[PDB]
Design a binder for these strands. Sequence first.
RNA 1: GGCGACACACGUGCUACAAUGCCCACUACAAAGCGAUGCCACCCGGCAACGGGGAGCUAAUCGCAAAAAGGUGGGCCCAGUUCGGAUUGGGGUCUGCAACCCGACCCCAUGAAGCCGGAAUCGCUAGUAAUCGCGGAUCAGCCAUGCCGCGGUGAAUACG
RNA 2: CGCCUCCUAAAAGGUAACGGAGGCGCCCAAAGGUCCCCUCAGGCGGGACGGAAAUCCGCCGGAGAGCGCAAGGGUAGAAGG
Lengths: 71, 181, 25, 84, 121
Amino acid sequence: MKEGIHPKLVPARIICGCGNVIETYSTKPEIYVEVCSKCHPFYTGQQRFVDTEGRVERFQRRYGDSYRKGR
Amino acid sequence: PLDVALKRKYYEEVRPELIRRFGYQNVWEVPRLEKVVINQGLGEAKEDARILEKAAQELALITGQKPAVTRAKKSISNFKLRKGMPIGLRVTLRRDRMWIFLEKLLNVALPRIRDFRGLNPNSFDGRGNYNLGLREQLIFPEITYDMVDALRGMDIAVVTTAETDEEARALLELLGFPFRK
Amino acid sequence: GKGDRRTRRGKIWRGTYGKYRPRKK
Amino acid sequence: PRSLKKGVFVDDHLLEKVLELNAKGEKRLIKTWSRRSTIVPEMVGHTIAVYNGKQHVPVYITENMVGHKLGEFAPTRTYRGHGK
Amino acid sequence: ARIAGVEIPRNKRVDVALTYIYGIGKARAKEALEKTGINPATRVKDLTEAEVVRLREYVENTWKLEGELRAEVAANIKRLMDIGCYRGLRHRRGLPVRGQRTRTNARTRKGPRKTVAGKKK
RNA sequence: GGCGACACACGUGCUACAAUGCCCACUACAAAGCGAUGCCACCCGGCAACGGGGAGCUAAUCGCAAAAAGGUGGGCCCAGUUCGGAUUGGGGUCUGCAACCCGACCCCAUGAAGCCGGAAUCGCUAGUAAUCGCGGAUCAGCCAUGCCGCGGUGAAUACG
RNA sequence: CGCCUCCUAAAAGGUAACGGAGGCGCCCAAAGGUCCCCUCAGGCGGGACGGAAAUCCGCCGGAGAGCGCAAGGGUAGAAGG
Ligand SMILES: [Mg+2]
Ligand SMILES: [Mg+2]
Ligand SMILES: [Mg+2]
Ligand SMILES: [Mg+2]
Ligand SMILES: [Mg+2]
Ligand SMILES: [Mg+2]
Ligand SMILES: [Mg+2]
Ligand SMILES: [Mg+2]
Ligand SMILES: [Mg+2]
């Protein structure tokens, strides 16, 4: 490249609950961000915290236990 | 030169699985990416030239490379312009720099998208180049949010040496890009 | 306020009781 | 709301006309004056001519309307705009 | 540290800060912090990272948040659409759904005031 | 089924636009009324509306019932911000063949417009104005913010 | 009423009519000299605010772009950027 207003791009580190991406090679080393996808959380791995659906289990099957009108 | 895990992930897992899939005889017709490009279409920067001073370095913080501005090609009076009027700026990233930008892209930049339920998979040009654009820029970890005052996204380009998009869809899945199946 | 169904001042203006104004002083 | 102390489907006049249309075949549209009634779950895929005040409107019971009653699917008031 | 998506509250008193999140009210923010046992009187700027990730492990898993909660509610309106219910056509017309006499003042859901001819002038 | 329809216009009211203010905990002090084909003391379950048991009361001896403003202490730092509560989703409790058009509430989220009101216009001369709650009538229940009453704190001003 | 361009103009040139149809009385210290580099308009897909084209990819595109201004000749193996 060329000497001037150009970042040196030093090897860095990023911390989260997901883990420490050791390499990551970016400017402003030892940065803090909220999450890291594709490690363990963030749906690619099929988490489904709430499994939101209310058309069958309380609207079609097991219906006599309570009333209706949606999910 | 600089040891990159994404190119290590390429050369160890992604590279040999594709030879098994399509039966590439030689080591070269296998899909390979070189020269990814980022375009920031600042159409709202037609009036101001000081706002680009506060946007070129902020795109440079996530790439590690200074971007170049692009001038207006012609003139259309429905938009405020002239033959000059620096509107957008575009930077291209290559070997050892394009790899590290993608590593921060798939894992740290991409999850910040609210309600992200996969990428649009039929966004291929037909040759093998998967384009996509983003509307927010603070998704990158280099932005601390306490230095941003203007909200502006970007259009990162894409590249491959694949003749068809069917060859690139696999490499775009084995490297880790989340799609809508 | 007096019309806010989730406060002491709103329950007394309405006349109903609940979590934000129990039947116990 | 009944608040679960008592069960749903208060009217006993139209269930006598629909509880055998499941065992016996011959799917037939039936007219009614029971707007106050609740919808029936075991009779999806049929039609009912619910009275709105002057004309019995036919309504296809689909898989989504197993929750609401019969009067919401029978408007007693029409508007069609007021720009005329 | 961002807790609920990206747009989160920060700077001065966690107890009423969390309320700014759609899907998080005054009661469930009091129902979710004592179970984490965090002092409601602390300012959000000075916290240890252990509880800000422990709080980012307890509210976004127990229930839906701003983005995904809007997706169900907007589709709940669409689910109550294309069936012909009174609740469905009342939204498509953009008028209030629970009674609320539309002859007089109902400008909250209808919108701004419009003016028509208005006879006898 | 409609009298409650709504692209509109007007009158009467209610709650607000906040810091001589809002929220939370504790602590006081009234008058007038009503209630054994009812008011419900007191426990138990539910975050709650309420439900199950169940004592007393033809009632200046029982119940509605808690009065609120006020007082003590803490939080908020004046930002459409725990001001403000509309609108909408879900879940529910009672009354009642029976609550979608047409109820009343309870809970969890919404938490919008409004930051002091153009031209005009109203009420009041001493415990009134302002502000704060309570009861009754009809009524199974109720859209009652209405109406009829009751008390608490308590101004200013009137040359003419 | 003078000048430029096309036609009439009959294949060198030239050629008239109150014949057909347009422009000019300027502009530029960069729009000039030299050296170096670069290739257009369009069409098709793809891509946040982006619409018939604001900036960007990837093919196709030897001239229809452009060459300050009318028109003609000419031009990318550039006089264009
Ligand atoms: Mg919120
Ligand atoms: Mg007039
Ligand atoms: Mg009437
Ligand atoms: Mg006595
Ligand atoms: Mg007098
Ligand atoms: Mg000639
Ligand atoms: Mg000749
Ligand atoms: Mg000749
Ligand atoms: Mg396009």
